[PDB]
Design a protein around this ligand. Structure first.
Ligand SMILES: NC(=O)c1ccc[n+]([C@@H]2O[C@H](COP(=O)([O-])OP(=O)(O)OC[C@H]3O[C@@H](n4cnc5c(N)ncnc54)[C@H](OP(=O)(O)O)[C@@H]3O)[C@@H](O)[C@H]2O)c1
Ligand SMILES: CN(Cc1cnc2nc(N)nc(N)c2n1)c1ccc(C(=O)N[C@@H](CCC(=O)O)C(=O)O)cc1
Length: 159
């Protein structure tokens, strides 16, 4: 099964041209904990912004163009991305917007970080219907000396 993992601000904003104006080490620890040892599928832009292969995981980058880093796996389509994952318990799709859009319809689980932040952005997580998902886990956190905003981690299973 396929899972999508994303950090969302108000209005489902997930990205913009510049760096997001927040500091959330807690979300990154959560992202790492949930993706370690699993294949992670990302779009070329996310790859670019991550900047290096993520350690301890099989990195698969979607691009219409030839790959420029032999350390990772480049694919030209959804289906190839999937086949490149092999026979594994769970595949993690890490972004970005165009990628989430194509994978949502095939995902069985959502790992979301809701951030209490109003940011202007040009990329959004796709619209999803709460009633199609069962919130199986949730945990609210206030901002602290390390985290600039309050956030909440939620795990949804498709009904
Ligand atoms: C910034 C953030 O945008 P974003 O979050 O939407 O970026 P994103 O999903 O991180 O990256 C999008 C890039 O992924 C590749 N991609 C996505 N779906 C693909 C498909 N079906 N087949 C081949 N390549 C595919 C394309 O790379 P290329 O531009 O390298 O084709 C595309 O421009 C604006
Ligand atoms: C920009 N980007 C994509 C990114 C960032 N936060 C997200 N947060 C969530 N919840 N979900 C995503 N898909 C997500 N994606 C990044 C940037 C850096 C690292 C990164 O260094 N992660 C290390 C963790 C490093 C650290 O813990 O500081 C890892 O090992 O996963 C990951 C994703």
């Amino acid at each position: 099964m396929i899972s999508l993992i994303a950090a969302l601000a108000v209005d489902r904003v997930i990205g913009m041209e510049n760096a997001m104006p927040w500091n959330l080490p807690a979300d990154l620890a959560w992202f790492k904990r949930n993706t370690l040892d699993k294949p992670v599928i990302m779009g070329r832009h996310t790859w670019e912004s991550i900047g290096r292969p993520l350690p301890g995981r099989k990195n698969i980058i979607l691009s219409s163009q030839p790959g420029t880093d032999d350390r990772v796996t480049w694919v030209k389509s959804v289906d190839e991305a999937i086949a490149a994952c092999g026979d594994v318990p769970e595949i993690m799709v890490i972004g970005g917007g165009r990628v989430y859009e194509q994978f949502l319809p095939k995902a069985q689980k959502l790992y979301l970080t809701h951030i209490d932040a109003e940011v202007e952005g040009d990329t959004h997580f796709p619209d999803y219907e709460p009633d199609d998902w069962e919130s199986v886990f949730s945990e609210f956190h206030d901002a602290d000396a390390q985290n600039s905003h309050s956030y909440c981690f939620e795990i949804l299973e498709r009904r």
